[PDB]
Design an enzyme around this catalytic site. Structure first.
Site, PDB file in Angstrom:
ATOM      1  N   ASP A 118       0.871  -1.181   0.000  1.00 58.18           N
ATOM      2  CA  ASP A 118       0.000   0.000   0.000  1.00 58.18           C
ATOM      3  C   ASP A 118       0.913   1.238   0.000  1.00 58.18           C
ATOM      4  O   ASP A 118       2.156   1.030   0.058  1.00 58.18           O
ATOM      5  CB  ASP A 118      -1.064   0.004   1.098  1.00 58.18           C
ATOM      6  CG  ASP A 118      -0.488   0.137   2.541  1.00 58.18           C
ATOM      7  OD1 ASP A 118       0.671  -0.222   2.801  1.00 58.18           O
ATOM      8  OD2 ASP A 118      -1.215   0.638   3.407  1.00 58.18           O
ATOM      9  N   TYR A 172       3.127   4.758   0.777  1.00 54.49           N
ATOM     10  CA  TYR A 172       3.845   5.212   1.967  1.00 54.49           C
ATOM     11  C   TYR A 172       2.844   5.933   2.858  1.00 54.49           C
ATOM     12  O   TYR A 172       2.002   6.707   2.341  1.00 54.49           O
ATOM     13  CB  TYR A 172       4.926   6.223   1.565  1.00 54.49           C
ATOM     14  CG  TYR A 172       6.151   5.623   0.915  1.00 54.49           C
ATOM     15  CD1 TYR A 172       6.902   4.674   1.576  1.00 54.49           C
ATOM     16  CD2 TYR A 172       6.583   6.023  -0.346  1.00 54.49           C
ATOM     17  CE1 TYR A 172       8.016   4.100   1.016  1.00 54.49           C
ATOM     18  CE2 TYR A 172       7.728   5.473  -0.912  1.00 54.49           C
ATOM     19  CZ  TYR A 172       8.461   4.515  -0.214  1.00 54.49           C
ATOM     20  OH  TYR A 172       9.637   3.990  -0.758  1.00 54.49           O
ATOM     21  N   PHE A 223       6.722   2.639  -4.094  1.00 59.94           N
ATOM     22  CA  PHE A 223       8.115   2.794  -3.649  1.00 59.94           C
ATOM     23  C   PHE A 223       8.809   4.103  -4.049  1.00 59.94           C
ATOM     24  O   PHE A 223       9.727   4.500  -3.381  1.00 59.94           O
ATOM     25  CB  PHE A 223       8.993   1.534  -3.945  1.00 59.94           C
ATOM     26  CG  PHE A 223       8.447   0.260  -3.317  1.00 59.94           C
ATOM     27  CD1 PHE A 223       8.630   0.005  -1.947  1.00 59.94           C
ATOM     28  CD2 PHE A 223       7.710  -0.632  -4.052  1.00 59.94           C
ATOM     29  CE1 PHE A 223       8.103  -1.124  -1.383  1.00 59.94           C
ATOM     30  CE2 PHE A 223       7.196  -1.775  -3.464  1.00 59.94           C
ATOM     31  CZ  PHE A 223       7.406  -2.004  -2.135  1.00 59.94           C
ATOM     32  N   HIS A 269       9.633 -13.977  -1.728  1.00 60.71           N
ATOM     33  CA  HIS A 269       8.900 -12.693  -1.748  1.00 60.71           C
ATOM     34  C   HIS A 269       9.151 -11.722  -0.535  1.00 60.71           C
ATOM     35  O   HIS A 269       8.199 -11.192   0.064  1.00 60.71           O
ATOM     36  CB  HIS A 269       7.365 -12.946  -1.913  1.00 60.71           C
ATOM     37  CG  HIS A 269       7.024 -13.975  -2.953  1.00 60.71           C
ATOM     38  ND1 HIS A 269       7.220 -13.758  -4.300  1.00 60.71           N
ATOM     39  CD2 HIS A 269       6.566 -15.244  -2.836  1.00 60.71           C
ATOM     40  CE1 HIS A 269       6.879 -14.839  -4.969  1.00 60.71           C
ATOM     41  NE2 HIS A 269       6.468 -15.753  -4.107  1.00 60.71           N
TER      42      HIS A 269
HETATM   43 CL   LIG Z   1       9.616   2.657   4.300  1.00 61.32          CL
END
Ligand SMILES: [Cl-]
Ligand SMILES: [Cl-]
Ligand SMILES: [Cl-]
Length: 224
Positions: A65, A67, A78, A188
């Site tokens: 999800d 930040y 990211f 993962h």
């Molecule tokens: Cl983070």
């Protein structure tokens, strides 16, 4: 606004089955504001991952999800805006792995827009979050949207490599395995797993080997 006004034309077609669910999520987001709650990223960046050409995607990177820190999430999993600093820990860890795997110097800023413009889909399983409360919008209806995105990519004839960062991401593995010409990197670990599985995972060089293996062009991962 309708789907075709919110996302790139190939994505508008791929996501047509969830047009109704996207409209319902827009109503959910209005209701959070009416209730006095905030959400991230900004409304205009929520679907930003789908504003790069569907037909060009060869790598999928999936996080949990956005930040939860105000100003970090920008609609590309990211990534952060170029003037954001220090980098979030997840991103610093990704960048360490980038340098170790590929040999390139550390990036100058945290903006992953170059990856997106080169056919990496920077997807989060859930596309909004309440500030400072990770997983706060889990099970509110984004999952049907992102499941549709992933199944539409898996349905193309074309090669695809998936990189699933964390438990929520890794739920997509069986949906991805259903498609032909789809390779999923395992295991993962999330970038926050750090030295317990993430560092040395070689995601970028593995992706490229798998793409070349399947007859596709590799990704240019280079960041300025
Ligand atoms: Cl983070
Ligand atoms: Cl709030
Ligand atoms: Cl930094």
């Amino acid at each position: 606004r309708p789907l075709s006004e919110l996302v790139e034309r190939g994505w508008a077609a791929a996501l047509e089955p969830v047009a109704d669910q996207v409209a319902h999520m827009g109503q959910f987001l209005r209701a959070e504001i009416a209730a006095g709650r905030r959400y991230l990223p900004a409304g205009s960046n929520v679907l930003r991952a789908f504003t790069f050409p569907f037909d060009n995607v060869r790598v999928l990177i999936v996080g949990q999800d956005p930040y939860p820190t105000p100003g970090h999430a920008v609609g590309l999993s990211f990534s952060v805006a170029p003037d954001v600093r220090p980098w979030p820990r997840s991103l610093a860890n990704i960048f360490d792995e980038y340098t170790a795997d590929l040999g390139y110097p550390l990036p100058s800023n945290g903006d992953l827009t170059p990856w997106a413009q080169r056919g990496v889909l920077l997807l989060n399983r859930v596309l909004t979050v309440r500030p400072s409360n990770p997983a706060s919008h889990r099970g509110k209806g984004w999952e049907a949207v992102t499941e549709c995105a992933i199944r539409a990519l898996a349905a193309r004839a074309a090669p695809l490599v998936a990189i699933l960062w964390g438990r929520d991401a890794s739920t997509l593995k069986p949906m991805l395995a259903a498609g032909n010409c789809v390779a999923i990197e395992s295991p993962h670990p999330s970038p926050l797993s750090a030295s317990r599985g993430f560092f040395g995972s070689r995601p970028f060089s593995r992706a490229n080997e798998l793409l070349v293996g399947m007859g596709a062009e590799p990704i240019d991962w280079r960041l300025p």
